[PDB]
Design a protein around this nucleic acid. Sequence first.
RNA 1: GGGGUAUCGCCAAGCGGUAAGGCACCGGAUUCUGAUUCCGGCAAGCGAGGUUCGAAUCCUCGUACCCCAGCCA
Length: 529
Amino acid sequence: TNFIRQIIDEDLASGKHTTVHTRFPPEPNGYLHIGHAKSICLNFGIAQDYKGQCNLRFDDTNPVKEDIEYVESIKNDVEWLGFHWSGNVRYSSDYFDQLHAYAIELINKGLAYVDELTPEQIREYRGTLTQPGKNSPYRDRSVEENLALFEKMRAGGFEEGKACLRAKIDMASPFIVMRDPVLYRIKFAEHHQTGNKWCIYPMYDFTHCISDALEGITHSLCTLEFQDNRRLYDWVLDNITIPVHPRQYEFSRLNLEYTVMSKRKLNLLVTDKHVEGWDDPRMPTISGLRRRGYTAASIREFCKRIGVTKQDNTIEMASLESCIREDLNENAPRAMAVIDPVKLVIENYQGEGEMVTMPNHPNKPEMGSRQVPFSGEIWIDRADFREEANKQYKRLVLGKEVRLRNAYVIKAERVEKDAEGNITTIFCTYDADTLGVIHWVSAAHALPVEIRLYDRLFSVPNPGAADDFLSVINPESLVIKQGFAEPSLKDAVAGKAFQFEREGYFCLDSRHSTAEKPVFNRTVGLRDT
RNA sequence: GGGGUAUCGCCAAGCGGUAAGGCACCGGAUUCUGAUUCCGGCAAGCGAGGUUCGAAUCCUCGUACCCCAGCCA
Ligand SMILES: NC(=O)CC[C@H](N)C(=O)NS(=O)(=O)OC[C@H]1O[C@@H](n2cnc3c(N)ncnc32)[C@H](O)[C@@H]1O
């Protein structure tokens, strides 16, 4: 429950509404991100929980900012998250003729006029946060003139910026949005849905309430920046001949630490090429989170966990991570991979290897077991061998043994180095029937793999607030390693994620991995303390 | 000027009745993943008054922060 669901209850009880009808209206000017997922779970979850409906509407009022690429993706991510919208997908542009007819009703009613103040002029006349605005000299034209002037605008008779339709409200309002807001402006730009049938486009404030009203939205849910705009939303509906009046409720938008959640900044990372694309695994987009290895289910739990309030907030990465870990910890099958490999030779082992039975999920036998090859020339992670160590360092020491994962207890008794004194091979001896701990990979049956270790995109908790957010990008957000995975991973499918024991949850990077060079994405590492 | 928000490190309940839950964090028990699971601990309600038997929940005075001067959304 949240303040909005409590409002909905009250409405239902009082009898103000018998059903609920919400909507998610993203402008198609970028890809969806985790914040949108908060708005999606909210609007679609509420709908289904109350057995109501929720529309997907593309608020496409600004042609020069949108693209058909984005609409195809948005539907995609909405469905991927697990939600279904009511009826066909809606577009604000589906109401372009209705909006126009309404502008004419306002004009006829005397509440709108065609203003000819330049774009700089309008701002000069607008007033300030503490100084009232002033009426334009064109404010008092006749209904007849406004009707003709507006049509002139519609027919392409005016150059861009040369005219616009404004609402005749109150230029001294303490609410800046009520100081004769613009309803329509001239843009000779082709629209992704209506082509070039229109040269004048409606503004958000005029478009949003009418679309909602027409669709029968019972609760228009949006973020806090639109708190001031509500006054205009109610004005527009109070002043046109329309049968319903959806009510608006605002909540705080999600902010996630170490990341930027704004289409404009996410666009820049994409445009300047500082990430592979909108779907780069380090991106906070739904597609990036997906490519990274997140489950639509873990994102929904995330939204369920963070809540819906009016308090501004900034969630920590730890919280999101807890969600995906909680999912993959139970569902992911274990496997063996080595990110940094140092050769280890068990001179005590004779033969060309053998096979060892390995569990697919330690704490869950039902997931089955697999047969993995063992031998005397394996691979281990460098961090596992230390010539020296305290009572706590549990791995391999140059005068001690350790349990090779799902296999034998071995004991390092020598080592060998190269020029820089870097070790190249560790010589050990194994025990007969020996079946800390360490994962491994037999060098003979080792699938060469490209591992991708991701990290926070930015090096500061609040990159948005930085002077130039791009200069604070983390140079280690991605660190590509060549390692070795046990041969079973040979059949990894870009879709499932396995747990690389003692390392993290990886998923076949569904973007670069060829049949020859598999590329794996590290979704999230394990909790390490 | 106006609109909003002020609870534990981060979120977030409680809506006059005597402070939930999650994440983080500090311990302990398990464990062939220093993981998991597992129990145990953890603070708190902007200041100042004011009504009340009693408020985090009501009221006033402040204070702090956030949003609004796109022919963006
Ligand atoms: N009255 C409204 O809802 C305004 C819709 C407007 N077209 C819009 O803001 N376009 S948008 O594409 O930028 O966003 C669409 C909706 O996504 C949600 N949203 C966007 N960013 C969000 C964030 N960081 N946290 C939570 N919710 C967020 C809002 O409901 C937004 O309206």
